[PDB]
């Protein structure tokens, strides 16, 4: 019988913002990133 996975619930809260900036011979390759913290929530997940 096939196992099946189910459930899983979390919530995203704001944690911060970041600016990554790679450099390659005086030219800039930038990227804005949003970091979110997590807070779990019902229903719990379970592999059946």
């Amino acid at each position: 019988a096939w196992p099946v996975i189910n459930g899983g619930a979390v919530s995203l809260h704001f944690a911060g913002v970041t600016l990554s900036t790679q450099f390659t011979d005086f030219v800039s390759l930038n990227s804005l990133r949003f970091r979110f913290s997590l807070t779990v929530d019902e229903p719990p997940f379970s592999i059946l």
């Binding site: 990554s20 790679q22 005086f26 030219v27 800039s28 390759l29 930038n30 990227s31 990133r33």
Partner: protein, 57 residues
Amino acid sequence: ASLIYRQLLTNSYSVDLYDEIEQIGSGKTQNVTINPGPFAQTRYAPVNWDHGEINDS
């Protein structure tokens, strides 16, 4: 005081001379070189947007 009329009529050739002045001074090359001021300009950088670092495994 009548001498002004005589002077104008006599010196009218300077009108054509002045026409030459202006219509060849225009022909001559001029370049007013507006500056950049003492304060110097600069742009940010060549900036390109990309996806950030990915945590592969």
